[PDB]
Amino acid sequence: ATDGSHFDFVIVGGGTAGNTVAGRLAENPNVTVLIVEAGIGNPEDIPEITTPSSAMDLRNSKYDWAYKTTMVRRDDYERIEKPNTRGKTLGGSSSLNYFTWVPGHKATFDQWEEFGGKEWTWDPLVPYLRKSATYHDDPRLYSPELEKIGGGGPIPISHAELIDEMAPFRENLTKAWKSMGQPLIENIYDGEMDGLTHCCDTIYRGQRSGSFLFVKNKPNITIVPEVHSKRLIINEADRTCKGVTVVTAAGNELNFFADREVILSQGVFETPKLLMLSGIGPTRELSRHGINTIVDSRHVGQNLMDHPGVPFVLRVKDGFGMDDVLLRHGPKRDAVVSAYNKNRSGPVGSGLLELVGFPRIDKYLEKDAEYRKAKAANGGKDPFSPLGQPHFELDFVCMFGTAFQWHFPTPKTGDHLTVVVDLVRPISDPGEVTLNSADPFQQPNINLNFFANDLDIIAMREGIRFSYDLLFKGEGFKDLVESEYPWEMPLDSDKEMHRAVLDRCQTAFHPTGTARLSKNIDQGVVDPKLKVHGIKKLRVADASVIPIIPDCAIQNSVYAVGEKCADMIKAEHKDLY
Ligand SMILES: Cc1cc2nc3c(=O)[nH]c(=O)nc-3n(C[C@H](O)[C@H](O)[C@H](O)COP(=O)(O)OP(=O)(O)OC[C@H]3O[C@@H](n4cnc5c(N)ncnc54)[C@H](O)[C@@H]3O)c2cc1C
């Protein structure tokens, strides 16, 4: 693209929400759309990206920003990690995520009204949660009612294309779940989600569904990959965003201008950073790095909220995990790889996550004196999920998962199950994204502030106990567990579990909230129409606008944010739509 070029709409960051907004705005073939993106433009040519079973190998690949991130910062414990994975490619993090497609709980979204008004509640958002996807049930295994989750969009979704060898695994896990007295549930898309489910996935016919499917074959979209954003171009007198400045691989600085609006979609970590480099952020933070303050927006980079997870691995009887087929070299792997390279069939096309649990653990919490005190102190309401939403998302990954064992080696033998104990309703205060400098090529400093509140530790511990009770005592699956890896979970000692939760936890990969939607600038950074408070012609569309983190994996809500952003943009530009 030519330096100085004008487009109707400029999307900064071709990620999950960015391409959604851009692709929807290009549906008038006369509207010009530009996308600037730091990573490659051709993710559909990359086997590791398009192949679902390769997803975990994308950590630390060239497609991963590989941020350093402080996981917990308590007086008694602190840990910083690398990589905290985020997609650096067209499609953003939808090009390297673990595929689960689940909206969340109606009570949670209804509370967004405090920030976005009544249009950001469950009932009005349901269509936006479905518009991006086209639902498939080719083997006709599930209720026809579930067709409603696909509104016809360009992201193909389906129930997991089940691995045949894992059917005994699935049957015993189901038997064990029911034997614990917890429900089975298949419709988790109407606002309720209590039980164990067959998850849906951004996978179809063994291929990853990435947001890049929004912006291909559209001559009115100009895609400029391999450029790094330097700054938003702001006119102070007009209080107007004009466009964006980027740096190319050759080190040249380019200006691109929007004649209607700029949409910032750089994700939860780079969106607040780019805002701050451009003069929009906490004035004292800006001054400390030599950046002039155009708008004192105290919430930029604040309210960073993510789901903590404590994963654990069990060695399981032979044939009840996929390690021997996909993780280890040999004839079995060669065979399924040959099949996949010819027609994309076989378990190489699997995301390896097929059953997902959304329990409450009230009976576990009630055994802890400190939880009981805290609930009574909250007037008798559960501090985590007072409106009946889940406490956990339990991903039962049917294999050893390196992306969930950050400090342990891969076992050299045996089949495994990786359980991701993902606390979806934490009550710890949020962390923050802050500037390290005015350098656009340095990462922001990132603190997730997991487990600031001791109660979240108590919950995560009990979520681990629930999972252990399920797998070691639950019927059918109890006969499949061979050992714990890499050592025993110290569930018999609360004091050791305290250390175990802090030292073994990680991000469940759901960061949100750093430019959140709100009614005014004293509450957040963008307004209910996703416009940056104090700036004209600037919207934000990505996970950073999310004001209350959903009760589950978040990609479904992120697409919805993009879908709604595009609709509100179209409604304002009547002369083009
Ligand atoms: C490992 C992993 C697994 C996940 N698994 C799941 C799952 O199973 N289910 C689920 O629901 N969610 C999952 N997620 C979360 C989900 O993928 C993300 O929350 C979502 O994709 C975020 O979308 P976004 O548009 O806000 O940001 P992103 O998709 O990250 O888009 C940001 C884009 O901006 C670009 N960009 C950033 N900074 C710059 C810059 N300075 N210059 C130029 N371009 C820039 C990036 O390269 C990227 O393309 C996972 C996330 C990760 C990291």
Side-chain angles (χ1 to χ4, degrees):
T2 311
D3 192 354
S5 291
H6 285 236
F7 309 74
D8 277 340
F9 293 110
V10 172
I11 285 71
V12 187
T16 311
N19 293 337
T20 300
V21 169
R24 289 299 186 196
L25 292 180
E27 282 165 342
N28 178 342
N30 297 304
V31 173
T32 48
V33 185
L34 165 71
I35 304 173
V36 295
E37 162 61 35
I40 57 151
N42 60 329
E44 301 179 69
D45 297 339
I46 313 298
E48 315 91 71
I49 286 173
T50 57
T51 309
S53 66
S54 292
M56 289 176 311
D57 301 319
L58 291 165
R59 286 207 319 145
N60 278 114
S61 70
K62 66 168 290 201
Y63 312 110
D64 173 15
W65 286 93
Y67 295 123
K68 294 178 169 173
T69 292
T70 298
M71 298 286 126
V72 352
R73 179 176 298 151
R74 293 159 56 87
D75 281 358
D76 67 354
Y77 184 91
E78 184 160 352
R79 175 152 57 83
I80 184 170
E81 293 284 348
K82 180 183 163 70
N84 188 16
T85 292
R86 289 286 108 182
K88 179 173 175 174
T89 168
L90 191 71
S93 294
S94 79
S95 293
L96 48 65
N97 67 12
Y98 304 134
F99 310 104
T100 299
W101 181 270
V102 49
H105 193 285
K106 169 177 169 346
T108 294
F109 281 99
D110 276 350
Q111 309 309 98
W112 290 24
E113 172 176 351
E114 178 183 0
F115 302 86
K118 184 58 155 236
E119 61 180 313
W120 286 97
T121 57
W122 175 258
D123 287 327
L125 283 169
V126 167
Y128 291 117
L129 289 157
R130 296 168 185 190
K131 184 167 172 177
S132 312
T134 294
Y135 175 80
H136 302 258
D137 186 356
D138 294 357
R140 283 185 314 108
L141 289 163
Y142 304 92
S143 172
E145 297 184 42
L146 297 176
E147 287 169 44
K148 64 179 158 212
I149 75 178
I155 296 128
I157 76 167
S158 170
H159 284 82
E161 307 176 311
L162 294 175
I163 310 176
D164 284 341
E165 176 173 49
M166 289 297 107
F169 167 103
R170 278 177 318 257
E171 192 212 322
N172 290 281
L173 180 54
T174 298
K175 200 171 303 170
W177 190 269
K178 292 167 68 75
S179 76
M180 300 289 309
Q182 287 294 303
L184 289 195
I185 183 152
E186 288 300 348
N187 174 27
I188 58 167
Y189 313 92
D190 279 323
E192 293 188 279
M193 39 192 308
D194 192 9
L196 177 76
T197 198
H198 291 85
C199 55
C200 291
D201 286 286
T202 44
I203 301 167
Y204 183 54
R205 305 203 29 180
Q207 296 280 72
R208 173 190 295 276
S209 307
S211 84
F212 45 74
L213 296 173
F214 263 100
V215 298
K216 290 294 226 65
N217 300 320
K218 295 184 194 191
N220 46 331
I221 300 180
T222 299
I223 297 181
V224 173
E226 321 263 28
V227 302
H228 201 96
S229 63
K230 169 195 189 189
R231 184 190 299 160
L232 293 169
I233 303 175
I234 310 292
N235 183 286
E236 300 212 32
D238 299 313
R239 297 177 208 274
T240 297
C241 183
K242 245 79 183 59
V244 68
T245 306
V246 307
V247 185
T248 65
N252 302 125
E253 302 199 344
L254 270 41
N255 301 318
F256 297 115
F257 296 95
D259 294 329
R260 302 308 176 104
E261 301 195 30
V262 171
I263 298 93
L264 176 52
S265 295
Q266 284 194 161
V268 64
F269 302 137
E270 296 279 350
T271 279
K273 174 185 145 198
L274 197 64
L275 280 172
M276 288 188 283
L277 294 174
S278 304
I280 308 157
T283 183
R284 215 185 314 272
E285 181 173 7
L286 268 42
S287 293
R288 187 180 337 117
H289 303 285
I291 308 159
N292 284 323
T293 299
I294 298 178
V295 174
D296 188 16
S297 194
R298 305 188 162 170
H299 286 277
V300 174
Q302 305 297 310
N303 313 301
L304 171 61
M305 200 80 178
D306 187 6
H307 290 321
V310 173
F312 68 84
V313 171
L314 302 183
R315 187 190 177 107
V316 85
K317 278 183 166 53
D318 278 4
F320 291 81
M322 300 296 300
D323 309 65
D324 216 67
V325 181
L326 297 167
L327 249 199
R328 289 190 285 264
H329 292 123
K332 293 183 203 184
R333 198 199 172 249
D334 278 335
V336 296
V337 170
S338 184
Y340 187 83
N341 283 345
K342 262 44 79 185
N343 74 339
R344 306 273 182 270
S345 65
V348 177
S350 167
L352 317 173
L353 173 50
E354 298 172 339
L355 293 161
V356 172
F358 298 99
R360 293 187 58 106
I361 61 160
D362 298 271
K363 75 187 203 180
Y364 288 82
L365 299 169
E366 296 275 20
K367 295 187 185 173
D368 180 285
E370 196 186 316
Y371 177 82
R372 289 196 302 275
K373 189 206 300 162
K375 178 179 186 114
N378 195 30
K381 306 172 294 220
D382 173 32
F384 305 102
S385 306
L387 311 180
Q389 49 266 95
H391 288 141
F392 288 89
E393 165 167 342
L394 309 176
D395 296 347
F396 301 91
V397 179
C398 59
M399 181 184 233
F400 181 86
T402 51
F404 298 94
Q405 301 279 267
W406 287 2
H407 293 277
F408 309 148
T410 299
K412 300 163 174 292
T413 71
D415 286 332
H416 297 85
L417 158 72
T418 312
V419 184
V420 186
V421 183
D422 176 346
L423 170 62
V424 292
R425 289 263 59 91
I427 63 165
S428 286
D429 283 347
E432 60 176 342
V433 176
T434 49
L435 287 183
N436 202 73
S437 72
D439 179 351
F441 289 98
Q442 272 182 5
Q443 69 163 86
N445 300 336
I446 306 173
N447 171 22
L448 294 169
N449 199 32
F450 285 151
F451 300 116
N453 198 311
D454 283 3
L455 224 65
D456 281 353
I457 297 182
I458 286 159
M460 176 67 79
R461 178 236 285 155
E462 291 314 314
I464 293 166
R465 196 188 316 284
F466 171 104
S467 303
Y468 264 69
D469 284 353
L470 162 77
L471 304 165
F472 275 89
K473 304 173 185 171
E475 181 94 347
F477 210 98
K478 67 182 192 49
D479 298 311
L480 306 178
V481 179
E482 286 190 351
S483 69
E484 306 180 59
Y485 180 93
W487 50 66
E488 297 170 81
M489 187 84 244
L491 280 163
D492 68 320
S493 164
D494 288 349
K495 178 172 279 102
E496 291 187 57
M497 284 306 289
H498 180 103
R499 165 70 178 208
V501 166
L502 294 181
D503 203 47
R504 292 220 245 182
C505 70
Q506 71 173 70
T507 175
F509 302 111
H510 310 328
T512 71
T514 49
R516 72 186 182 185
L517 70 99
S518 63
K519 293 173 170 169
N520 52 73
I521 202 172
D522 280 294
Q523 188 190 32
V525 345
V526 310
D527 74 11
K529 310 290 164 191
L530 295 183
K531 303 179 171 209
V532 166
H533 292 289
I535 302 286
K536 294 189 227 46
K537 296 192 177 67
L538 184 58
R539 292 171 132 118
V540 173
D542 58 37
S544 68
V545 311
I546 289 177
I548 303 173
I549 187 173
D551 308 68
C552 55
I554 67 167
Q555 89 174 312
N556 188 192
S557 71
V558 170
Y559 278 102
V561 163
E563 296 282 11
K564 181 169 177 55
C565 186
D567 267 7
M568 301 183 303
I569 290 175
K570 291 180 182 181
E572 169 162 337
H573 301 271
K574 307 183 283 294
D575 66 328
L576 300 178
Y577 296 110

